[PDB]
Structure 1
Amino acid sequence: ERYENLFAQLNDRREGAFVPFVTLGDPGIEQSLKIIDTLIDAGADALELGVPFSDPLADGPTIQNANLRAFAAGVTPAQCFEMLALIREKHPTIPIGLLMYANLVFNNGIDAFYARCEQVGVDSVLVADVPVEESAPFRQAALRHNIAPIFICPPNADDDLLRQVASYGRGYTYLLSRSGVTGHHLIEKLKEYHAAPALQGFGISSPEQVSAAVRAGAAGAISGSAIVKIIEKNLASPKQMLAELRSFVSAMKAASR
């Protein structure tokens, strides 16, 4: 819902979207809430938010430590949902997507997880260890609760996958920049198949990368490790953290225009 409105608006301003990722509760509840408010104020068109998990096997070292730090703070999924409800109460239109690992979604029931997402105002859920092949109950529960199920279009894909990602996905199509963990012509075929707008992610850490993604025909770009690195580098400097974050975001967002 919010993604469609955002993409229509951005299209009208001929600009790409810049979407930052951060781990919820990193490095703590309060500071995380402030980090998130800063990202939004600096220009973030949408947010990608991780719920701390014990075994993030799709994340590089930078985000692995993001999770460690959040755990050091005692952040639980229940508390993440309280944070989510508050962020939505503060920002009514910004699209909010969650980055989840399958066990946190399946734990107390898949349907129940997506219902809670709807309740707090989350817009999409990307389950990192659920490939299209195992996605049926997740995408079905997502749709029943007006949540966009986010699918990964890897670089090493094919037509079959492309057609599935296009028919199954909603909100945005996660266009992987490469193989590996967190640290071109696909875009056209996606448009050919009326797929949700493509958002490129993985390795996006500079303004030119954002400009290049939008030029290739992507609706925007996602950046996480580069954002999380600013957090870890300023742990002892809460204020400087926000300032540097503010700087990077505005630069990245500017590249999208």
Structure 2
Amino acid sequence: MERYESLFAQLKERKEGAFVPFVTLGDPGIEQSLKIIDTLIEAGADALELGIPFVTPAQCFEMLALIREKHPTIPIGLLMYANLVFNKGIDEFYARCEKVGVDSVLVADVPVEESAPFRQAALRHNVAPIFICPPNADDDLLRQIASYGRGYTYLLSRAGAALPLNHLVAKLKEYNAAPPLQGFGISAPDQVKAAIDAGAAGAISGSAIVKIIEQHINEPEKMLAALKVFVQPMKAATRS
């Protein structure tokens, strides 16, 4: 929706896909985390995929509000399980997401057929209902997902029968599904480079982002450089 849309528009004209790193809010720390997200951004990031722990929620939402204010157009999408949402009452969650800036919210554990209350809640509070399309999704599921989801589409790699990731992108182009962002096991310019050739609109990585934070969880300033060094290439793997 809006942000995601436009971002994808200016990605077309540039003949390039998007690189969407994944990070866990408040990891390793709140001040550091923020200090991370900005760096990811100014390194090539076109859209963030922010993970939510369980650092309380009010803080994670407080950071999202900060990020937003700091970065107005960057597509902010969250990734979490149903508990937190089930905790704050479905509606109030999304309403609280619509108030801090988030553009979309993917609730793992919620299976497609039981998404109803979320798909509505996000739509009620202008948030994009995001779904996961497994590598082995049947024509039926494809059709479901395509219509139900707004913003972007989370395409599951054949690493998480899996039809080649090209058939899928097409089967989406066909049923007007939101632009697909392939995720899972993509921590190399190689895989990102391929992801896009296959027709996906962008890649997502998170493991690598974690490992680097790990090896430098003592060097706050060094940790960022490694991350600053990490993006550019990955992000560059999505061009010309």
- Kindly indicate whether residue 238 of structure 2 is the aligned counterpart of residue 256 of structure 1: yes
Q: Distance in 2 between matches of 1:186 and 1:170?
A: 17
Q: Which amino acid aligns with 1:37?
A: D
Give the CA deviation at 1:179: 5.2
How far residue 208 of structure 1 moved from its aligned partner, in angstroms, is 1.4
Is structure 2 residue 134 aligned with structure 1 residue 133?
no
Matches within 5 A, 1:186-225: 186-225=168-207
Give the secondary structure class of the aligned counterpart of 1:171.
coil
Deviation of residue 243 (structure 1)?
0.2
Instruction: Please give the TM-score of this superposition, normalised by the length of structure 2.
Output: 0.96
Unaligned runs of 5+ in 2: none
Match of 2:29 in 1: 28
Name the structure 2 match of 1:6: 7
Q: Secondary structure at the match of 2:237?
A: helix
Deviation >4 Å, runs of 4+: none
Corresponding letter in the other structure for 2:219: S
How far apart are 1:187 and its partner, in Å?
0.9
Deviation readout 1:34-68 (Å, 9 max, x if unpaired): 00110000010000111111xxxxxxxxxxxxxxx
Given that 2:196 and 2:202 are in contact with CA atoms closer than 8 Å, whether structure 1 keeps it comes out as yes
2: CA distance between counterparts of 1:196 and 1:76?
31
Q: Is the 8 A contact 2:159 2:185 kept in 1?
A: no
**Does the alignment pair 1:153 with 2:133?**
yes
The match for 2:91 is 111
1:162-187 CA distance string (max 9 Å, x none): 0001000111110001354xxx2111
Q: Separation in 1 of the partners of 2:237 and 2:14? A: 13
Unmatched 5+ residue regions in structure 1?
54-74
Deviation string 1:136-190 (CA, Å, 9 cap, x unpaired) is 000110011110111000012100100001000111110001354xxx2111001
What RMSD, in angstroms, separates the aligned Cα atoms of the two structures? 0.8
Partner AA of 1:11 in structure 2: K
- Work out the CA distance in 2 between the residues paired with 1:8 and 1:108: 34
Q: Distance in 2 between matches of 1:6 and 1:138?
A: 24
Structure 2 residue aligned with 1:72: none
Q: Which residue of 1 aligns with 2:102?
A: 122
Structure-1 residue corresponding to 2:62: 82
Q: Percent identity?
A: 85
Q: Which residue in the other structure is 1:51 paired with? A: 52
Cα displacement (A) at 1:227: 1.1
Amino acid corresponding to residue 27 of structure 1 in structure 2: P
